[PDB]
Amino acid sequence: PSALHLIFERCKLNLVEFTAQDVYQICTTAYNMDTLGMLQDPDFMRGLHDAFRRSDQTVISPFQANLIADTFRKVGINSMPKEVSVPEEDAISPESLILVLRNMNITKQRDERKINEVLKLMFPILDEFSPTQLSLTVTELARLKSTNADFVGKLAKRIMEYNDDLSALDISSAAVSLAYCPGISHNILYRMMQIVEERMGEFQPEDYINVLHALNTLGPKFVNTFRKIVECGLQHVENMDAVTLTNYMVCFSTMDYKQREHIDIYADALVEVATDLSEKDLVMAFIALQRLRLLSDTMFGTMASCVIRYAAKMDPRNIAPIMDICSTVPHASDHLMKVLMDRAVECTRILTANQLGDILDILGLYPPAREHPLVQLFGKQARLRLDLM
């Protein structure tokens, strides 16, 4: 490959004038096909990164820059896309400050001074926003964990004003983003929940998930909306996804639902399809079932069997909850308990102070843990960690 070798050499020596779009195209073909030794060759990738760092990245989308950075990081080159400045006085438009926020969110590099600057250039021109632009900027501000509640409240009032121009997904996303904001007012939240429950007959499972997350974040002050959604979703309980059933369980635990008639139906529906849950969802379902006092003789066995296939590679932060659930429940969990102790013995090196303390506390009164070899290892590790406890 004389021509290919010459092209690679000219790219390595930084003698080719590359545009951002050309670097993006090269990254895409290297990450997709990779028939050539592009990613395996370090010098060519270093030269491409040097060309990309000095290029003009304004002519590419935030997603494209993120993909370029991800491709560079996959091989070892520590790459980070440039930070875009706030638009000048002429380019101050509702569609450009939203772009600034979107790039800040996508590239995972947030500057609070820039957030304040683009929040002070949005108020005078806030009357030029499209109905969907408000629902976009609300979620963008929520995802940046901004503490400005007055701006979000004004945005929510405007979103309420253009109710008829928004789809169900926009309403649900606005509701959940509003619920995530800590300092927002409660009258706005009540109005938004009324709006959601008025347009609640068109919800897709994604909108159900968003509404359930919003309710769980808000707390037991909004029982009526949860009661309405429980009464509505009773028709769909059998034909329902597992994740939204787990979210129903979490909301049931949070609100302290005293109507224990539908709880049985939803719990049975969840335990029927519990086989299709990941680590976090299964752990949350376990906690919600325990806090609702639902662990029976048979469903506990099925959930434990589901946990068995996950207990080998559980995260260190998901071992203590299952141990606590097994401890409180009076049923048989010896096999699961032994597997969890083995996993904890494996993870003793990376366990933090709090997780190690919880693991030791749950196994304080456990008879089989007396002779298990975790005692000496955990004692030595606790002696080492005693400075951080």
Binding site: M80, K108, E112, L384, R385, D387
Partner: protein
């Protein structure tokens, strides 16, 4: 070892703790430095806690402000200012204490404003950690210190602090030179209300801090002296020398405590090191007590061990011996020959003190004199007029007569001629200096000197 950035910060903090308060094992420091060298947080998202821990552990292990990890952490602290809550504020402040860049100054000032604004909503842990962290940076925000002292007094009126908190608080408030008699009175009252919960290890540092702060009240010193007299038996050489220094700082002539302390010191004469001997001699010089048997014992022990003598230890020892009058023959020779080897470690004022102590005792060795004179060109910039006069007189007694060494000293003298020629003492010293160097060596200083001002 491949780990997540949070899982790396946790082990880094553990390594810092073990290397800090569980023996300074060099292998731990080398392993931590190697681990942190390849650590980067450019892509992964972390809490403020993890970034603060990484920055603190990097700065602790010798990493300056030019590294990639330090730059990324400082950039994070500059951008996301509202995520650095009170819990993770002292960590960032302590990390930025040593750094003296522009970003470090901005971060320190922002954290100072945040702490001064929220000084009324903290607890014992947060207040103690914040004041301890702000002690190390050398900042001079008096309004913040007043707010924190007020909060300390209100929080300690209800018996919240304990021995470790009181020790840390006293050390932090004494290092910052805040002579608030009410604050230290409250700290002392809280200490005395902690009956038998203030052990020796928590009592000696409190006395040291109360001595260093320089409180005018002499009634407080009496209680500390009595409680020390009760606790003498349970002490090593470190705390004996520590209270020698502390009660030298107080400046009150106690008798029974000094006798018992001298008895315990001569008991532990086989455990004294260079720093303890230097501290004891300096304390005796400061207090003025003449104890010739103890001086003989300390001189013999210092003769026994000479390699451990650092520049500070050497300077303090020779100054104390010269001031007292007692002096050995071979001990001085060993100290001078050793200081010749480590002449590149003396500070701006330690060098002057050592040179003047050797000159005043009429002990002149060519190697030591040459080493100190050649070294006395990087330190003339940081010298006061009195120290410059002392160094010039030491050089005159050493008979250097080297222009490359003399012209910076004379430049410093000319740049500080008012404080040089108007010293209440030292007139005979300057007269001898000018008698040695003559009028033609430096005209302008001669013209000023024949004008008396």
């Amino acid at each position: 070892s491949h780990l997540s950035a949070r899982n790396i910060a946790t082990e880094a903090l553990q390594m810092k703790k073990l290397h800090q308060e569980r023996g300074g094992n060099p292998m731990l420091a080398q392993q931590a430095r190697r681990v942190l060298f390849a650590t980067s947080i450019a892509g992964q998202n972390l809490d403020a806690r993890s970034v603060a821990l990484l920055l603190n552990t990097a700065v602790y292990f010798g990493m300056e402000s030019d590294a990639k990890l330090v730059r990324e952490c400082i950039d994070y602290c500059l951008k996301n200012d509202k995520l650095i809550t009170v819990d993770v504020l002292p960590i960032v402040v302590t990390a930025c204490a040593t750094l003296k860049s522009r970003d470090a100054r901005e971060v320190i000032e922002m954290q100072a404003q945040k702490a001064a604004r929220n000084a009324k909503f903290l607890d014992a842990k947060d207040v103690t950690n914040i004041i301890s962290a702000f002690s190390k940076t050398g900042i001079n925000h008096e309004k913040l210190f007043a707010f924190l002292s007020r909060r300390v007094q209100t929080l300690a009126r209800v018996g919240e602090f304990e021995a470790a908190h009181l020790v840390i608080l006293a050390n932090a408030f004494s290092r910052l030179r805040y002579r608030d008699k009410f604050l230290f009175g409250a700290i002392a009252r809280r200490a005395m209300s902690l009956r038998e919960r203030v052990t020796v290890n928590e009592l000696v540092p409190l006395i040291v801090a109360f001595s260093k702060i320089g409180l005018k009240d002499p009634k407080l010193s009496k209680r500390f002296a009595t409680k020390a007299m009760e606790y003498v038996d349970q002490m090593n050489a470190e705390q004996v020398a520590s209270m020698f220094m502390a009660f030298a700082y107080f400046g009150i002539r106690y008798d029974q405590l000094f006798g018992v302390l001298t008895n315990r010191a001569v008991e532990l004469i086989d455990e004294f090191n260079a720093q303890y001997i230097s501290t004891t001699l300096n304390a005796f010089q400061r207090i003025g007590i003449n104890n010739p048997e103890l001086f003989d014992n300390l001189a013999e022990r210092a003769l026994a061990v000479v390699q451990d003598h650092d520049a500070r230890d050497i300077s303090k020892t020779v100054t104390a011996l010269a001031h007292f009058g007692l002096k050995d023959e071979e001990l001085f020779k060993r100290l001078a020959s050793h200081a010749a080897s480590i002449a590149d470690q003396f500070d701006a004022m330690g060098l002057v003190n050592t040179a003047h102590a050797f000159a005043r005792t009429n002990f002149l060795q060519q190697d030591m004199a040459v080493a100190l004179s050649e070294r006395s060109v990087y330190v003339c910039r940081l010298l006061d007029a009195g120290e410059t006069r002392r160094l010039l007189w030491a050089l005159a007694k050493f008979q250097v007569r080297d222009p490359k060494i003399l012209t910076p000293v004379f430049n410093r003298c000319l740049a500080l001629h008012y404080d040089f020629f108007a010293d209440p003492t030292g007139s005979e010293e300057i007269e001898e200096i000018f008698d040695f160097y003559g009028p033609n060596f430096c005209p302008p200083l001669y013209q000023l000197y024949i004008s008396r001002g």
